[PDB]
């Protein structure tokens, strides 16, 4: 039902078609087993020609006729066999594929629209809950999974029956109890293989979980890189837990891996067992009773049936997932909650004009338990009036304003617009009649002309003009290139928040409702802009009854009536003066405020060599692999022999022949395999281990010893990075295992296939090889056309998706809701294109697939016919055809490889290339010399010469152009400028995180450019904006193991002492052993920073780098900070850059630098004596 039905819902001819194609499928599966019967009949007559050709010591002419008659006889049987099965195949396959698509196609598309629009209709709820980025995510993700649900399904049916009727058909109709001996031994052994192999395949997955755990405990926090460099390099830790848990779950998962190799060994062991019981039980049931040397037909066939069962399984799986996640989220789809709002008909209010009425409205947010912010609210506003609301505590003001848009619904009481109940009037009509301007001026990724269009569909640039002109925007818009026809560059991040809001107005203004609300929309914006804005508001208000919420009591003045609020508390209402004269709330407050990487440069064999390096040696590996190749050919021939001697040879010892070859095949494959595998498993496996481990190490280090523009200015987050760790270590592991499997299959197939290709008959040799490369090339072009169509498809659907996103994501549309559908409409457009495009491709796959099959029966019919060719009186055409099985299934061997084992070597290579280039690096500052920390460098006079720099992004114009400063010893070097850059960049330069473009610095003598980077970073005391510390124990944080700097207890104590954080150190559970607790999410920036300080001073710098240290704080925190900073400074050189135009006075040398160049400098009252720059700073400061 719902689950499956609803899943498979919608489709007149869709459904019908569906069934049809399905039928085709069935016939298809059945097609291959009947195919096996043919194997029979032809091979049977072949056998008879083998015993009459094996007699040979008698009539020569009777052999001419008898054997030739048999030739053209089966030659006819051949034509008709492949012809039938074949053409059929081509046809049926084509049909079904059409099923998959067409069906699922139309289906999806439908589900498409319905989901878009549904979402669009869940109202507030999609705000209420949801993660809304998550919502659309599943839009795309889930829909797709459903589609794949319908198509793979078709697949499942196909094979489901291939094995059902196959195993039946042959597995009964041809044996009557022999087909059964099959049934017995065959179905049985199949059970054992599937069984043990799955038990440890699952054991394998348990290995993948314990594995992911070792990995994270091998991940750790690697962000805060900066602070990190101003610290040195963890580098032991990472390695410690890294190789630790790795090595462990390595050998171990590599044990279960060698166990999956003990699995491939099991399966091949068991399979070998297949041969045992197979050939044995036959040998008997083919020597004694039922003598046809054909039984193999049945046995072999049904076996194939068990395999259909398997392939059947993954398809099913797909049906499941698609089904599942699809129907359950489809439930979150089709579902029509709605009702708390809607968008369909209603009560039409054409009376125009009216007054807002809030009569006893109690309300609680959707989050059930939350406290009813609107504990019975009574408020009513006349028309044409400008009524404001005042608040500050948060929640209620908005909440209410909100309700007025019938956004959520009242928990009790009612709201009457004009004189009717809002909940009565139509929603759209309502929402329309309601012009609102929240604060966030959300704009679209289109032309302005458009955003306004959105305001109201039909409309001429005429009106628009007027609107924008009444929304006072007609100007800047004109000065703006391209005019109204100008776009908003990818989202609304191109113009000034102000203008934006303005436009919104215009927009809403075009709406021209009769009710207006301003959710602080002036709020969060500079002054001047603010005033112009409010201006617009007014010109838009007073012609329309309005209500506003704002902390700008000023613009609140001209309030026709103020409402007393503060976090949900309805009190004093009335004109300004009345509340002021009310010495209460209004009055009160009035007086209180006064992940895309992807890189071209690959590496041909470059990875292999690096590969070989990271590889100690394991000829053993390649070796055993090789022999494994030799093994496949072995089996193939072993069979060719078996069937051979049996169908054409001497009557006595047919038993020892069978019993042997059979046992042979057994011991051979089985034993040789289990061993070849297991052993290789352990070897190559280890390779993967050390490689991954060692690899990570080197790499990560490369990062450690890496820096400069990298992390200082990264476009490579801590995630893409860590990921690099995991994913890429695994991938190189890939390059190795592959090279291994490569040589294997090769020599395997090539080497042996060819030696056999020699014992061949020159027929097959050429013909067949022609067939393998051919069919192979088909499989490759197939995969290519399939992924190509999949990629471009994701492209068109991407465009449609993104837009969809913009909408949903930006629900602030339902704000005006005059688009909902309109939106969805546009999508239908986009969607229409990739839809017709879908049908086309549908067909494609069809033909493609069907052609695969074509080459299938094709190549085997022409191959077998040509084989049998000339068998008149006993020519060079006999049992060797099995040797044909050899070369052919060897092609099937190559496919066993490019289809199994290691990754397709593609992404393995990418990730390899990446991880390499990275580990390569180009250090940039590591061991060195460039001095000797001579016992006379303890000065500090930092000297800045030329100072011309700009971090990698030079086309952004150097943020340091021709600069030069200086700071004596043991004093205070004040620093002030415009904002953001300049200050920091300077501190950094000292840290020499980026050697300037031209210039240099003298710590006190030698040249920092040419000074021992390390040491230069030994004596430094940076305390920047956002403080940070790993999740160690604070005693550990403090005792910042800079270098040899052993965790000196009385030393770190000394740190908490001067760092002023000893107040906490004293008590606070444990005392000095208190970890940062949860990574450091249990303290105030004042405490952290203090430790930051504790850091600095515990290092005993000779230079203090204060980068606007305390920018976000308060009270005794900024106080005890300026104190510890006061006692931690003056005893040594210290640059104090900041935005503390307040405690910037007490500075030995205040330097006003103007981004790029220095502008003023000197003692405070002197800089003040030079009125203008520094002056205008103390003045704007006020
Ligand atoms: C994709 C399908 C062909 C699929 N193979 C694999 O999933 C696979 C995974 Se590793 C692997 N095959 C390796 C490699 C060497 C292919 N094969 C062997 O060790 C081996 C030993 Se005897 C034998 N194969 C015969 C022969 C008829 C080959 N194969 C089958 O009865 C058969 C039935 Se379904 C199937 N194969």
UniProtKB/Swiss-Prot annotation:
Residues 356-592, 942-1180 form the ABC transporter domain. It catalyses: ATP + H2O + xenobioticSide 1 = ADP + phosphate + xenobioticSide 2; ATP + H2O + phospholipidSide 1 = ADP + phosphate + phospholipidSide 2; a 1,2-diacyl-sn-glycero-3-phosphoethanolamine(in) + ATP + H2O = a 1,2-diacyl-sn-glycero-3-phosphoethanolamine(out) + ADP + phosphate + H(+); a 1,2-diacyl-sn-glycero-3-phosphocholine(out) + ATP + H2O = a 1,2-diacyl-sn-glycero-3-phosphocholine(in) + ADP + phosphate + H(+). The chain crosses the membrane at residues 12-34, 81-101, 151-172, 180-200, 259-280, 295-316, 619-639, 664-684, 740-760, 762-781, 842-864, 881-902. PROSITE patterns: ABC_TM1F, ABC_TRANSPORTER_1, ABC_TRANSPORTER_2. It comes from the Eukaryota. One of its GO terms (cellular component) is brush border membrane. It is an enzyme of class 7 (translocase). ATP 1 binds at residues 391-398. ATP 2 binds at residues 977-984. Its EC number is 7.6.2.2, 7.6.2.1. Residues 35-80, 173-179, 281-294, 640-663, 761, 865-880 are extracellular. Keywords: ATP-binding, Cell membrane, Cytoplasm, Glycoprotein, Membrane, Nucleotide-binding, Phosphoprotein, Repeat, Translocase, Transmembrane, Transmembrane helix, Transport. Glycans are attached at residues 51, 55, 58. In mouse the MDR gene family includes three or more related but distinct cellular genes. Translocates drugs and phospholipids across the membrane. Catalyzes the flop of phospholipids from the cytoplasmic to the exoplasmic leaflet of the apical membrane. Participates mainly to the flop of phosphatidylcholine, phosphatidylethanolamine, beta-D-glucosylceramides and sphingomyelins. Energy-dependent efflux pump responsible for decreased drug accumulation in multidrug-resistant cells. Interacts with PSMB5. Belongs to the ABC transporter superfamily. ABCB family. Multidrug resistance exporter (TC 3.A.1.201) subfamily. This is ATP-dependent translocase ABCB1. It comes from Mus musculus. The lineage of its organism: Eukaryota, Metazoa, Chordata, Craniata, Vertebrata.
């Amino acid at each position: 039902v719902s689950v499956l039905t609803m899943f498979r819902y919608a489709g007149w001819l869709d459904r019908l078609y569906m069934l049809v194609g399905t039928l085709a499928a069935i016939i298809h599966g059945v097609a291959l087993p009947l195919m096996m019967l043919i194997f029979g009949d032809m091979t049977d007559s072949f056998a008879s020609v083998g015993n009459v050709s094996k007699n040979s010591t008698n009539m020569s002419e009777a052999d001419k006729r008898a054997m030739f008659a048999k030739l053209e006889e089966e030659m006819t049987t051949y034509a008709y066999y492949y012809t039938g099965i074949g053409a059929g195949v081509l046809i049926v396959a084509y049909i079904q594929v059409s099923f998959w698509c067409l069906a699922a196609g139309r289906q999806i598309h439908k589900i498409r629209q319905k989901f878009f629009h549904a979402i669009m209709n869940q109202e507030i709820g999609w705000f209420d809950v949801h993660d809304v980025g998550e919502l659309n995510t599943r839009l795309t993700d889930d829909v797709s999974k459903i589609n794949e649900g319908i198509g793979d399904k078709i697949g499942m049916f196909f094979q489901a029956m291939a094995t059902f009727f196959g195993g039946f058909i042959i597995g009964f109709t041809r044996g009557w109890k022999l087909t059964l001996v099959i049934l017995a031994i065959s179905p049985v052994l199949g059970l054992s293989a599937g069984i043990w192999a799955k038990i440890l395949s699952s054991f394998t997955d348990k290995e993948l979980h314990a594995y992911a755990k070792a990995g994270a405990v091998a991940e750790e926090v690697l962000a805060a890189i900066r602070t990190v460099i101003a610290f040195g390099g963890q580098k032991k830790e990472l390695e410690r837990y890294n190789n630790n848990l790795e090595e462990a779950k390595r050998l171990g998962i590599k044990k279960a891996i060698t166990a999956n190799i003990s699995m491939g060994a099991a399966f091949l062991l068991i399979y070998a067992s297949y041969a045992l019981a197979f050939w044995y039980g036959t040998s008997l049931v083919i020597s004694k009773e039922y003598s046809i040397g054909q039984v193999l037909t049945v046995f072999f066939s049904v076996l194939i049936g068990a395999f259909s069962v398997g392939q059947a399984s993954p398809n099913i799986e797909a049906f499941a997932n698609a089904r599942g996640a699809a129907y359950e989220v489809f439930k979150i789809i089709d579902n029509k909650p709605s009702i708390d709002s809607f968008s369909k008909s209603g009560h039409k209010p054409d009376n125009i004009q009216g007054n807002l009425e809030f009569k006893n409205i109690h309300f609680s947010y959707p989050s059930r338990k939350e406290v009813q912010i609107l504990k019975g609210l009574n408020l009513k506003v006349k028309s044409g009036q400008t009524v404001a609301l005042v608040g500050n505590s948060g929640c209620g003001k908005s909440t209410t304003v909100q309700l007025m848009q019938r956004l959520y619904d009242p928990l009790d009481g009612m709201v009457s617009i004009d004189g009717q109940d809002i909940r009565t009037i139509n929603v759209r009509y309502l929402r329309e009649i309601i012009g609102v301007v929240s604060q966030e001026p959300v704009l679209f990724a289109t032309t302005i002309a458009e955003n306004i269009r959105y305001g109201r569909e039909d409309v001429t640039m005429d009106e628009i003009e007027k609107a924008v002109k009444e929304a006072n925007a007609y100007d800047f818009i004109m000065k703006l290139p391209h005019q109204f026809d100008t776009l908003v560059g990818e989202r609304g991040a191109q113009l000034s928040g102000g203008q934006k809001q303005r436009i919104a107005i215009a927009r809403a203004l075009v709406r021209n409702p009769k009710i207006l609300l301003l959710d602080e929309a002036t709020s969060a914006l500079d002054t001047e802009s603010e005033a112009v804005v409010q201006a617009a508001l007014d010109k838009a208000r007073e012609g329309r009854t309005t209500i506003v919420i704002a902390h700008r009591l000023s613009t609140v003045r001209n309030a026709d009536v103020i409402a007393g609020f503060d976090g949900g508390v309805i009190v004093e209402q009335g004109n300004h003066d009345e509340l002021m004269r009310e010495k209460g709330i209004y009055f009160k407050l009035v007086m209180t405020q006064t992940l895309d990487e992807d890189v071209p440069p690959a590496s041909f064999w470059r990875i292999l060599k690096l590969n070989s390096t990271e590889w100690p040696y394991f000829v053993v590996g390649i070796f055993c692999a090789i022999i494994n190749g030799g093994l496949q050919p072995a089996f193939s021939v072993i069979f060719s022999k078996v069937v051979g001697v049996f169908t054409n040879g001497g009557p006595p010892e047919t038993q020892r022949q069978n019993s042997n070859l059979f046992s042979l095949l057994f011991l051979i494959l089985g034993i040789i395999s289990f061993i070849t595998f297991f052993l290789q498993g352990f070897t190559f496996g280890k390779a993967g281990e050390i490689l991954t481990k060692r690899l990570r190490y080197m790499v990560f280090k490369s990062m450690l010893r890496q820096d400069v523009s990298w992390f200082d200015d990264p476009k490579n987050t801590t995630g893409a990075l860590t990921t690099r760790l995991a994913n890429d270590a695994a991938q190189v592991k890939g390059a190795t295992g592959s090279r291994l499997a490569v040589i294997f299959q090769n020599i395997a197939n090539l080497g042996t296939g060819i030696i056999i290709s020699l014992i061949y008959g020159w027929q097959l040799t050429l013909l067949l090889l022609a067939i393998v490369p051919i069919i192979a090339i088909a499989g490759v072009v197939e995969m290519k056309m399939l992924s190509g169509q999949a990629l471009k498809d994701k492209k068109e659907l991407e465009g449609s998706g993104k837009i969809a996103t913009e909408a949903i994501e930006n629900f602030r549309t339902v704000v005006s809701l005059t688009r909902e559908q309109k939106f969805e409409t546009m999508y239908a457009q986009s969607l229409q294109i990739p839809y017709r495009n879908a049908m086309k491709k549908a067909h494609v796959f069809g033909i493609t697939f069907s052609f695969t099959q074509a080459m299938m029966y094709f190549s085997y019919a022409a191959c077998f016919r040509f084989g049998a060719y000339l068998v008149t009186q006993q020519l060079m055409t006999f049992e060797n055809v099995l040797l044909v099985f050899s070369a052919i299934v060897f092609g099937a061997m190559a496919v066993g490889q490019v289809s199994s084992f290691a990754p397709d070597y593609a992404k393995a290579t990418v990730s390899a290339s990446h991880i390499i280039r990275i580990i390569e690096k180009t250090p940039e500052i590591d061991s060195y010399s460039t001095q000797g920390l001579k016992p006379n460098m303890l000065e500090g006079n930092v000297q800045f010469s030329g100072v011309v720099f700009n971090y990698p992004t030079r086309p952004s114009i150097p943020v340091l152009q021709g600069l030069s400063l200086e700071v004596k010893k043991g004093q205070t070097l004040a620093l002030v400028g415009s904002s953001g850059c300049g200050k920091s960049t300077v501190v950094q330069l000292l840290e020499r995180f980026y050697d300037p473009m031209a210039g240099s610095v003298f710590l006190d003598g030698k040249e920092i450019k040419q000074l021992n980077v390390q040491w230069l970073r030994a004596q430094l005391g940076i305390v920047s904006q956002e403080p940070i510390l790993f999740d160690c124990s604070i005693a550990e944080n403090i005792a910042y193991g800079d270098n040899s700097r052993v965790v000196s207890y009385e030393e770190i104590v000394r740190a908490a002492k001067e760092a002023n954080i000893h107040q906490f150190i004293d008590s606070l559970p444990d005392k000095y052993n208190t970890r940062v607790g949860d990574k450091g999410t249990q303290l105030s920036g004042g405490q952290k920073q203090r430790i930051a300080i504790a850091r600095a001073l515990v290092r005993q710098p000779h230079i203090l780098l204060l980068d606007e240290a305390t920018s976000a704080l308060d009270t005794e925190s900024e106080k005890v900070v300026q104190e510890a900073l006061d006692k931690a400074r003056e005893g040594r050189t210290c640059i104090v850059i900041a935005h503390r135009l307040s405690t910037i006075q007490n500075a030995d040398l205040i330097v006003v630098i103007q981004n790029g160049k220095v502008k003023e400098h000197g003692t405070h009252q002197q800089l003040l004596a030079q009125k203008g720059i520094y002056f205008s700073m103390v003045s704007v400061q006020a």
